[PDB]
Amino acid sequence: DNPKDLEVSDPTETTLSLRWRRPVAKFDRYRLTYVSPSGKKNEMEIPVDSTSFILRGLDAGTEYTISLVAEKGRHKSKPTTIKGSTVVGSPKGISFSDITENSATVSWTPPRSRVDSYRVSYVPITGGTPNVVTVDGSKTRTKLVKLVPGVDYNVNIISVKGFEESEPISGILKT
């Protein structure tokens, strides 16, 4: 009897949350293998008492073929397979420079993940509707204009690849 309903939840940049149904048959343990697009196969043995396990140490915005199997002794059951891709990576550090009464140069350090663009949003701490500016993936910085003098600005930056958009990083910008 093989593990049924293997599903992946809560995609992270480096993790995937796995959940499945336990086998009706008596068994030893589980063996989880997952290979990357390069064909790198990783194994792990999971306790008979688990129906959930957080997969970790993965790369960002990468798809994985995940397969679970119940090892009954020396007999591995029929493999249960699914695919799960990690979410695209977040930029690593937001920094501000060339501040002024009306403009600032926000810059960020690029992630180790293929990226098409970045969505830089900014709004004053007191609230309002964001002002989003898109900039090409090769670019690592941008200029903000029309900035009101003396006011703290919440500035978020998000990576985008295809339709996938990572977790944002943010910083306060003081005009």
UniProtKB/Swiss-Prot annotation:
Residues 2-86, 90-175 form the Fibronectin type-III domain. It is found in: Secreted, Extracellular space, Extracellular matrix. Expressed in the brain. It comes from the Eukaryota. Induction: Induced by TGFB1 in embryonic fibroblasts, in vitro. Homohexamer; disulfide-linked. A homotrimer may be formed in the triple coiled-coil region and may be stabilized by disulfide rings at both ends. Two of such half-hexabrachions may be disulfide linked within the central globule. Interacts with CSPG5. Extracellular matrix protein implicated in guidance of migrating neurons as well as axons during development, synaptic plasticity as well as neuronal regeneration. Ligand for integrins alpha-8/beta-1, alpha-9/beta-1, alpha-V/beta-3 and alpha-V/beta-6. Belongs to the tenascin family. The fibrinogen C-terminal domain mediates interaction with CSPG5. This is Tenascin. The lineage of its organism: Eukaryota, Metazoa, Chordata, Craniata, Vertebrata. The chain holds residues 957 to 1404 of 1808 of the full protein.
